[PDB]
PDB file of C-alpha atoms in Angstrom:
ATOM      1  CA  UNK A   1     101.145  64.198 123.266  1.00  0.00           C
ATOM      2  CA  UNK A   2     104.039  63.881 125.532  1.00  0.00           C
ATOM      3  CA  UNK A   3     104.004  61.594 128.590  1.00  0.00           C
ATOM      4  CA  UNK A   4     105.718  63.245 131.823  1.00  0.00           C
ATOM      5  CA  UNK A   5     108.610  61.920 133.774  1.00  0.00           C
ATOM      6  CA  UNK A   6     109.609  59.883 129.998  1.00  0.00           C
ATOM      7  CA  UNK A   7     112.457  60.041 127.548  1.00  0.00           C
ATOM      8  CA  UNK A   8     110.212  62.241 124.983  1.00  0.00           C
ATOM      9  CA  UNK A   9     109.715  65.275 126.976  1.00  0.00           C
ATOM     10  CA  UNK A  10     113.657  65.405 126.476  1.00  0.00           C
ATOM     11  CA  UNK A  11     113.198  64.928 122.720  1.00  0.00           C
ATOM     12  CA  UNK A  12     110.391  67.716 122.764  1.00  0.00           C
ATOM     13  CA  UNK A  13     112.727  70.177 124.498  1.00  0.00           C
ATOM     14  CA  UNK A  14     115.856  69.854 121.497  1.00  0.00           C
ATOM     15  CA  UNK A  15     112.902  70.328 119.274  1.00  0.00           C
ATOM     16  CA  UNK A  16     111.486  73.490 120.356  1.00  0.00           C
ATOM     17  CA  UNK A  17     115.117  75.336 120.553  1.00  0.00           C
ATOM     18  CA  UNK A  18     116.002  74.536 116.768  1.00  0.00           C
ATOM     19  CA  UNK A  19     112.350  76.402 116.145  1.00  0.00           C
ATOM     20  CA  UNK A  20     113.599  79.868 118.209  1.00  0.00           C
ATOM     21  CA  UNK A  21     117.130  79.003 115.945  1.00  0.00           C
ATOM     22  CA  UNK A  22     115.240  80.521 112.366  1.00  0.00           C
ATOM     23  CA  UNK A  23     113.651  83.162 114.352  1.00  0.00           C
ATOM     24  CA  UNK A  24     116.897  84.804 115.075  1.00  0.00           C
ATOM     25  CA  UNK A  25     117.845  83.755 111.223  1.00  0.00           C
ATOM     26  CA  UNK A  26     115.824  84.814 108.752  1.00  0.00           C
ATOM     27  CA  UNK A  27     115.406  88.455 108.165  1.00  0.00           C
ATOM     28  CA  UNK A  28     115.126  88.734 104.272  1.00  0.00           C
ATOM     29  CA  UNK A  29     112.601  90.118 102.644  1.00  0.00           C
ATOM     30  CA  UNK A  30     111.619  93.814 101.408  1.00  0.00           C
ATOM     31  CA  UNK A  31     115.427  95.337 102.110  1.00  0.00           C
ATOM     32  CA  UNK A  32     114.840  99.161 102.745  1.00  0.00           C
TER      33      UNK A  32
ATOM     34  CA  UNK B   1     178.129  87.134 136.893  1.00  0.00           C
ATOM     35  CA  UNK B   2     176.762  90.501 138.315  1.00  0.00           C
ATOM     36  CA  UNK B   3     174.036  91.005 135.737  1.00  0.00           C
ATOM     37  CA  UNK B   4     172.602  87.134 136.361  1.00  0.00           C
ATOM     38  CA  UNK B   5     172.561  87.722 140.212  1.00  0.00           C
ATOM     39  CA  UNK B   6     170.877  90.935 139.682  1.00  0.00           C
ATOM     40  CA  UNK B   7     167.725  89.394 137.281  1.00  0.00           C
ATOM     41  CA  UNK B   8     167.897  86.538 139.944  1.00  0.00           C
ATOM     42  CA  UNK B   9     167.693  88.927 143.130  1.00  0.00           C
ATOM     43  CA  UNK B  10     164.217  90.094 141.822  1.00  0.00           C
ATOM     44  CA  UNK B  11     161.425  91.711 143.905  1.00  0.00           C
ATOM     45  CA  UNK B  12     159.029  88.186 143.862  1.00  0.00           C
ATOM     46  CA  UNK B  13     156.297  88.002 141.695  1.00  0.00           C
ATOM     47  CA  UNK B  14     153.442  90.168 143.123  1.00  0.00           C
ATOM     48  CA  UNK B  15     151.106  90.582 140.019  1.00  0.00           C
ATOM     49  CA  UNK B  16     148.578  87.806 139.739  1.00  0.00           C
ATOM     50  CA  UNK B  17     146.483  87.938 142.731  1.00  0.00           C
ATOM     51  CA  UNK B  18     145.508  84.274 142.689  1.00  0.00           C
ATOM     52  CA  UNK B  19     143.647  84.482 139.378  1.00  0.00           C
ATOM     53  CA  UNK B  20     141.086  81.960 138.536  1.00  0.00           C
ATOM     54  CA  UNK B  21     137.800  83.481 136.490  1.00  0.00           C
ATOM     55  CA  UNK B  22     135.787  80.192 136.074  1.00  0.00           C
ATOM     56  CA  UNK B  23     137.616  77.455 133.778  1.00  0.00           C
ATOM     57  CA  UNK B  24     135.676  75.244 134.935  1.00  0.00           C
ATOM     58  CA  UNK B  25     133.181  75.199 137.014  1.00  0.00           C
ATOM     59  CA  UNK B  26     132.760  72.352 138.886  1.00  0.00           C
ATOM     60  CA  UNK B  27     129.463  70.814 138.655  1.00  0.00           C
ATOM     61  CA  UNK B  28     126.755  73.301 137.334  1.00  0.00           C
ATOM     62  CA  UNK B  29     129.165  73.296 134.149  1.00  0.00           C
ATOM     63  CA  UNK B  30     128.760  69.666 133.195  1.00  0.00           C
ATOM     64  CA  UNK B  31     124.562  69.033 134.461  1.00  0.00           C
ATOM     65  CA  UNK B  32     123.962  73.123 133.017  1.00  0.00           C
ATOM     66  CA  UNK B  33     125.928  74.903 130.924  1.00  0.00           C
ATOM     67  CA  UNK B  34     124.189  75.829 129.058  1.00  0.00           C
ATOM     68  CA  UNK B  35     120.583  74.089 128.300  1.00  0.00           C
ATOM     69  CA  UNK B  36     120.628  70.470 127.541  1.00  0.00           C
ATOM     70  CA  UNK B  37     123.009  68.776 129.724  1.00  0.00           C
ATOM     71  CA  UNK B  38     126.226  69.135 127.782  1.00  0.00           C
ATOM     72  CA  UNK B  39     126.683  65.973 126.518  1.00  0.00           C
ATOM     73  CA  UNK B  40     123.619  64.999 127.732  1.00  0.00           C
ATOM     74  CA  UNK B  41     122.996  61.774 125.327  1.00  0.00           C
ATOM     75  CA  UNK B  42     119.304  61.233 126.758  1.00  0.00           C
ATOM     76  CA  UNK B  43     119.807  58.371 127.952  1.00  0.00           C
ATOM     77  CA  UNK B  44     121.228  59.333 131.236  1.00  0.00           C
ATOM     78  CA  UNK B  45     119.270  62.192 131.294  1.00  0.00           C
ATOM     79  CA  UNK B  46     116.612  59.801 131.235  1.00  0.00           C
ATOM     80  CA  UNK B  47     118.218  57.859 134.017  1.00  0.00           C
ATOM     81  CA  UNK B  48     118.184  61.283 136.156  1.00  0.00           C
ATOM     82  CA  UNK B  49     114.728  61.907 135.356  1.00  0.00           C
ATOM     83  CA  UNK B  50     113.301  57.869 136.018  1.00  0.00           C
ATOM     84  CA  UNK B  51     115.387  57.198 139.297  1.00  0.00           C
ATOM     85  CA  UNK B  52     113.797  60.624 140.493  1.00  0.00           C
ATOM     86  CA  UNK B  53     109.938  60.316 139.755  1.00  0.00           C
ATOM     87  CA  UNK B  54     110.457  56.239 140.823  1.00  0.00           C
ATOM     88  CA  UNK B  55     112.232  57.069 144.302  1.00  0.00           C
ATOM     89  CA  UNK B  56     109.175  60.301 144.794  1.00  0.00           C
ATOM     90  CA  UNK B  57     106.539  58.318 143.749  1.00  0.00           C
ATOM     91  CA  UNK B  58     107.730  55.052 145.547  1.00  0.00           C
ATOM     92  CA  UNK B  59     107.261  52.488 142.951  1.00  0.00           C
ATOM     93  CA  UNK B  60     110.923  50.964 143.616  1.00  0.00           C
ATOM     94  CA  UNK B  61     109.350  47.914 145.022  1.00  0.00           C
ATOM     95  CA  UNK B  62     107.188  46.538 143.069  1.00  0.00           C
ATOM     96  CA  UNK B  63     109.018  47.335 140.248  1.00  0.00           C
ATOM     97  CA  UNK B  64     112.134  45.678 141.304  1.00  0.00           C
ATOM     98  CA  UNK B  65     109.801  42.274 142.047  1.00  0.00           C
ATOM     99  CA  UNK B  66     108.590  42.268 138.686  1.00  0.00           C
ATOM    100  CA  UNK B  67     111.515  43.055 136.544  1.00  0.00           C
ATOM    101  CA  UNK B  68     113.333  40.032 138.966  1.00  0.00           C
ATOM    102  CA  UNK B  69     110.381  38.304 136.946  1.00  0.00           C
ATOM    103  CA  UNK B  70     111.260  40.527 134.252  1.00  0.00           C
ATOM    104  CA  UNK B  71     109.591  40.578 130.562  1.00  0.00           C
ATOM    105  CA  UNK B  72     113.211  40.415 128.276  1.00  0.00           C
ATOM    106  CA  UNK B  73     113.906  36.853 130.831  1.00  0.00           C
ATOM    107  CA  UNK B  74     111.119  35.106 128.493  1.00  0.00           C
ATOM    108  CA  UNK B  75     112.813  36.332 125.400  1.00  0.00           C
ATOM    109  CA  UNK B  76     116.700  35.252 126.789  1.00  0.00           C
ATOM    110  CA  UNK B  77     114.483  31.619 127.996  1.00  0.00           C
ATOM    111  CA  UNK B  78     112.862  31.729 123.969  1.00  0.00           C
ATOM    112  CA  UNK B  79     116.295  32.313 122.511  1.00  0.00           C
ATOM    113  CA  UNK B  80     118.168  30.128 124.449  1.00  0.00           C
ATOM    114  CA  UNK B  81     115.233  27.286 123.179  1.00  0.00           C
ATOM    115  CA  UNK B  82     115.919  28.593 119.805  1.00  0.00           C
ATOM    116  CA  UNK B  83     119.810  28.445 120.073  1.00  0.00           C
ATOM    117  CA  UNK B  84     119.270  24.528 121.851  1.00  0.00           C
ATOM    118  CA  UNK B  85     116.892  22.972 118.947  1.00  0.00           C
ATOM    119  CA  UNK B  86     119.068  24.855 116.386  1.00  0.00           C
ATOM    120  CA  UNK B  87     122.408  22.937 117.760  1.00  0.00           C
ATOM    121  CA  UNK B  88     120.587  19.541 117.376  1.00  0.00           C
ATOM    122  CA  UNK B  89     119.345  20.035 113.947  1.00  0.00           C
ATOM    123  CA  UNK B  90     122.882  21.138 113.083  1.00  0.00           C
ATOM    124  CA  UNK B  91     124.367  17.730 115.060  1.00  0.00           C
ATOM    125  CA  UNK B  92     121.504  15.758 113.438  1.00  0.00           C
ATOM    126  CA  UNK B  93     122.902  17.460 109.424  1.00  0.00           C
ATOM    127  CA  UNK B  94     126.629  16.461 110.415  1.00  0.00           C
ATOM    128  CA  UNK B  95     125.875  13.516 111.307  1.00  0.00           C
ATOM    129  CA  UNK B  96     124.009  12.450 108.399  1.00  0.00           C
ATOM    130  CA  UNK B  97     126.247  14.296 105.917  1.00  0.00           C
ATOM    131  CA  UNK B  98     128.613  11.888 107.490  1.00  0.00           C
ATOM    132  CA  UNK B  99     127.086   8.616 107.462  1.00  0.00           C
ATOM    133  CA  UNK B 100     126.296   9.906 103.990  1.00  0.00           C
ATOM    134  CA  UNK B 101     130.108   9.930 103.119  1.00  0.00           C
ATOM    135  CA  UNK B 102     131.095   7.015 104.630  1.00  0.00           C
ATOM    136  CA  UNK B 103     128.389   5.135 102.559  1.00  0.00           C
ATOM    137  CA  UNK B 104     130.071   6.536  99.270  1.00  0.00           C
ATOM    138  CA  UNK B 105     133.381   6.069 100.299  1.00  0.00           C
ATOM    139  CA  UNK B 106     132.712   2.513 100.896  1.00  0.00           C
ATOM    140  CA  UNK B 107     130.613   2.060  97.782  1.00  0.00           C
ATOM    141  CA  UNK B 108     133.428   2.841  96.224  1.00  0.00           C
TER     142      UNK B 108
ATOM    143  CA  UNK C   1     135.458  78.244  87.574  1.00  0.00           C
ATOM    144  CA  UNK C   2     132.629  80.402  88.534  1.00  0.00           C
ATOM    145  CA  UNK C   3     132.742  78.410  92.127  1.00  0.00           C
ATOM    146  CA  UNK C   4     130.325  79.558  94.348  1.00  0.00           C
ATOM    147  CA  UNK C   5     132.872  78.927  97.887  1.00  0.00           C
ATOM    148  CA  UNK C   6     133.715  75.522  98.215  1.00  0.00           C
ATOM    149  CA  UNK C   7     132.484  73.323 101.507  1.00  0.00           C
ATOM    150  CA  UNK C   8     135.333  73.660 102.917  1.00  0.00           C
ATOM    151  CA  UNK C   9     135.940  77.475 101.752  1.00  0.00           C
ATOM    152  CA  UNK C  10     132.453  78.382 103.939  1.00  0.00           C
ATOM    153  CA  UNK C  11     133.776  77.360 106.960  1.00  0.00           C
ATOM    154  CA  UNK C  12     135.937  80.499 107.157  1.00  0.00           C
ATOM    155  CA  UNK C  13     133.118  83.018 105.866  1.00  0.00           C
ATOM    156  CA  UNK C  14     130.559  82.718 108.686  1.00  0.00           C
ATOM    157  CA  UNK C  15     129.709  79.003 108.729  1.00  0.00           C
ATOM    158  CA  UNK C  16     132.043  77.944 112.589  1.00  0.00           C
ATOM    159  CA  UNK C  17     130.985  80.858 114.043  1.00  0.00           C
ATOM    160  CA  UNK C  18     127.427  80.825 113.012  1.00  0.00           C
ATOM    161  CA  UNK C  19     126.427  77.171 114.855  1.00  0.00           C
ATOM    162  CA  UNK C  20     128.739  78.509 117.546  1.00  0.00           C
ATOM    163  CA  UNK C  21     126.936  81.486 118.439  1.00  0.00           C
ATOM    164  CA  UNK C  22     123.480  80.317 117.279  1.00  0.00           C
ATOM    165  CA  UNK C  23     123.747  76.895 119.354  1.00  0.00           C
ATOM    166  CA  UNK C  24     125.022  79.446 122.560  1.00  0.00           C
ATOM    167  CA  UNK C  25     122.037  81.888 121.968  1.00  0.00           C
ATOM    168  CA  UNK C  26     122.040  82.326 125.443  1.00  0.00           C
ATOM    169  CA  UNK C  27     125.127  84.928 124.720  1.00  0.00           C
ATOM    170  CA  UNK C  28     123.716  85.531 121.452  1.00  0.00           C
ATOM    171  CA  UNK C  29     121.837  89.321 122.722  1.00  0.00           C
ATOM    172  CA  UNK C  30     125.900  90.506 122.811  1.00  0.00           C
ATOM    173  CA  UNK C  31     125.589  90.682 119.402  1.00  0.00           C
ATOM    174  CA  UNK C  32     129.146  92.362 119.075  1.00  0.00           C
ATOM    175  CA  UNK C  33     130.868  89.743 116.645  1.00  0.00           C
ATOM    176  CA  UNK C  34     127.824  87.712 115.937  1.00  0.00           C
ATOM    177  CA  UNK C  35     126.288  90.811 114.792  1.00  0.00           C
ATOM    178  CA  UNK C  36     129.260  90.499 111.807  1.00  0.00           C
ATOM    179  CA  UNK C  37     128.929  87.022 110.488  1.00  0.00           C
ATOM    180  CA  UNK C  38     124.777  87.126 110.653  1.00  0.00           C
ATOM    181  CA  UNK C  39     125.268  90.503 108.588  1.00  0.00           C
ATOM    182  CA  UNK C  40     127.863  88.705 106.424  1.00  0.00           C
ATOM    183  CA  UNK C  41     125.707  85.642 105.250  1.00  0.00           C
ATOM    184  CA  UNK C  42     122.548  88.284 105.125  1.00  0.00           C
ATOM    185  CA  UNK C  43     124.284  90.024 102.454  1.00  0.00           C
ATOM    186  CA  UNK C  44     125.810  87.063 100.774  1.00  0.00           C
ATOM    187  CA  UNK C  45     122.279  85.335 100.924  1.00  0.00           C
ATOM    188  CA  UNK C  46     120.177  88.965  99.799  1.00  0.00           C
ATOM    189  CA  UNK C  47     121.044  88.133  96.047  1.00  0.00           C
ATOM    190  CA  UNK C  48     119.580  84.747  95.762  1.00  0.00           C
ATOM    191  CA  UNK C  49     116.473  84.350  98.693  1.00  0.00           C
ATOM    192  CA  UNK C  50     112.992  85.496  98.625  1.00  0.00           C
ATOM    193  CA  UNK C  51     110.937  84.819 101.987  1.00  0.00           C
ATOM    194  CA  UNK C  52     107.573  86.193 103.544  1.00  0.00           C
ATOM    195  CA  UNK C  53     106.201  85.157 106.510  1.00  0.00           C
ATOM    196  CA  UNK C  54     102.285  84.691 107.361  1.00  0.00           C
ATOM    197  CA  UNK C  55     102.666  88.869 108.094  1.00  0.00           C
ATOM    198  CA  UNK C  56     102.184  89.487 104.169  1.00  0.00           C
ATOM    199  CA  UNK C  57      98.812  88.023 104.591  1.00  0.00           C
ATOM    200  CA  UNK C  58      96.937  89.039 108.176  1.00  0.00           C
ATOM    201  CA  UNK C  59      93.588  90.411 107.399  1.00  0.00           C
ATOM    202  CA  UNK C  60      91.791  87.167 107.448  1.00  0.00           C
ATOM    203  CA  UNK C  61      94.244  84.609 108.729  1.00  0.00           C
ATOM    204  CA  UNK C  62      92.699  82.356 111.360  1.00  0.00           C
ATOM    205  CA  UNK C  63      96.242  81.951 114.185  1.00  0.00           C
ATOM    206  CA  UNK C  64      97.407  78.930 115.685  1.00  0.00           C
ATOM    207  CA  UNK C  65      96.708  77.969 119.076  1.00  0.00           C
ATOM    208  CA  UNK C  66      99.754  75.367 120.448  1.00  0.00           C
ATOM    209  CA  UNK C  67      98.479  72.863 123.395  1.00  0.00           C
ATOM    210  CA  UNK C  68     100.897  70.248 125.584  1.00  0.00           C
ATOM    211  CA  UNK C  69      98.816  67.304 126.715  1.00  0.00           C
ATOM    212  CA  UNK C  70     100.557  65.081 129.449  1.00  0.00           C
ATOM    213  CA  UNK C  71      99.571  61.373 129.441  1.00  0.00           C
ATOM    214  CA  UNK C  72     100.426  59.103 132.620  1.00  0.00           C
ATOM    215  CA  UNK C  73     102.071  55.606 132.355  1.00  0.00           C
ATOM    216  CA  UNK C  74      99.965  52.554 132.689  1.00  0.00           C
ATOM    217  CA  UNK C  75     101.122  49.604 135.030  1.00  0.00           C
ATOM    218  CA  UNK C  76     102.748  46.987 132.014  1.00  0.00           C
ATOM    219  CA  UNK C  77     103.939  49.786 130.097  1.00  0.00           C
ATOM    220  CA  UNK C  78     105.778  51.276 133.019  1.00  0.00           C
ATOM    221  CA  UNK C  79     107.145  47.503 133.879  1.00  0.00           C
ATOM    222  CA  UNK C  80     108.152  47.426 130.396  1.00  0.00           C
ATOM    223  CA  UNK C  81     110.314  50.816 130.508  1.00  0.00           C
ATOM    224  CA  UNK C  82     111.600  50.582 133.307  1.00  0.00           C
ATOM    225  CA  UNK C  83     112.927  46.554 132.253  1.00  0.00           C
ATOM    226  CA  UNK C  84     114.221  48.003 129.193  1.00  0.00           C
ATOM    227  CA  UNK C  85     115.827  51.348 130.959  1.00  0.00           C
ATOM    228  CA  UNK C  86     117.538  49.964 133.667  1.00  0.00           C
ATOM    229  CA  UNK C  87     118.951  46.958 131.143  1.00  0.00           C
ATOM    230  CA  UNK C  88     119.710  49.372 128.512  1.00  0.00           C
ATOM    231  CA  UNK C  89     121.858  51.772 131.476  1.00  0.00           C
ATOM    232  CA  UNK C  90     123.370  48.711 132.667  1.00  0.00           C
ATOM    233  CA  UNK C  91     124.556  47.075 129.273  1.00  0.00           C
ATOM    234  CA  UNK C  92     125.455  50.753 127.965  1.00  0.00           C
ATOM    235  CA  UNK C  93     127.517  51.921 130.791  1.00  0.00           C
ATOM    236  CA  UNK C  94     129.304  49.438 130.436  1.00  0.00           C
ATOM    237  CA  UNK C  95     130.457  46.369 128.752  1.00  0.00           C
ATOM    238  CA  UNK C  96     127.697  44.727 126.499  1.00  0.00           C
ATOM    239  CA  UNK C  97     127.573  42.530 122.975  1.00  0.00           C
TER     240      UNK C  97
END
């Protein structure tokens, strides 16, 4: 839930950039 | 003397080309570059965003009537109350600490 | 003193650059010295990490569906913000308490 036109939506966005930060971190696993 | 006239009687300095590759830009540096305002510290952001959808929306009105009532007025009118009654209990402890003390003093 | 790298002694291997790049990911796809320091703390991280996504297990794995719901502003509330936002930008802005 995130009201428009509001501080959260601002919040929200910082948020959703950390997430896409581990996808272009973690690439352990099986090493070939 | 001849070899300081000669570096002095140079041919200009024709090389740069009036330089300048960004550093800074003006404006679309400091509101986006890159995302999230640099330096944004919400708050402003949030200042950008409000004064927008109020001044599209057309709510300035209305809103400026009732915040010249206001909601945080009552609490400065409660706390001032508080701060008022506070004073004269302290005034009415002095004053009784002191007629206290002048009691003992003359007792003896 | 078997030291792993002290707090201090990170901030040369990778560490500066890392949050410099990473935070800047727009740039990020040049990948010509990032490409260095992400391959640096891989290998320095290969001896002691062990992760596995949901792609291990896919045969019967229900997925996730994300959803945004927007909500409006009643008439108090949006007295009440915009009371506290205008006297929050005009005591911060400036002097205050």
């Amino acid at each position: 839930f995130v009201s428009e036109h509001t501080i959260e939506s601002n919040i929200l966005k910082k948020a959703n950039q950390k997430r896409q930060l581990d996808n272009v971190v973690i690439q352990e696993g099986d090493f070939t | 003397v001849q070899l300081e006239k000669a570096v002095r009687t140079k041919s200009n300095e024709s090389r740069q080309h009036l330089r300048r590759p960004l550093k800074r830009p003006p404006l679309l540096e400091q509101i986006i570059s890159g995302g999230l305002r640099p330096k944004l510290t919400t708050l402003e952001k949030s200042q950008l965003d409000w004064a927008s959808y109020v001044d599209r929306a057309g709510l300035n009105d209305e809103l400026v009537l009732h915040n010249k009532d206001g909601f945080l007025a009552r609490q400065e009118f409660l706390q001032r109350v508080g701060s008022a009654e506070d004073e004269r209990y302290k005034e009415l402890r002095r004053q009784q600490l002191a007629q206290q003390l002048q009691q003992d003093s003359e007792a003896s | 003193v078997s030291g792993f790298a002290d707090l201090d002694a990170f901030q040369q291997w990778f560490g500066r650059p890392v949050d410099k790049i990473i935070e800047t990911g727009q740039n990020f796809g040049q990948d010509k010295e990032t490409k260095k320091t992400v391959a640096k703390l891989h290998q320095v991280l290969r001896p002691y990490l062990l992760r596995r996504l949901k792609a291990d297990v896919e045969k019967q794995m229900p997925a996730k569906y994300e959803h945004i719901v927007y909500c409006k502003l009643s008439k108090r509330q949006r007295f009440l913000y915009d009371d506290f936002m205008s006297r929050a930008q005009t005591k911060a802005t400036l002097a205050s308490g």
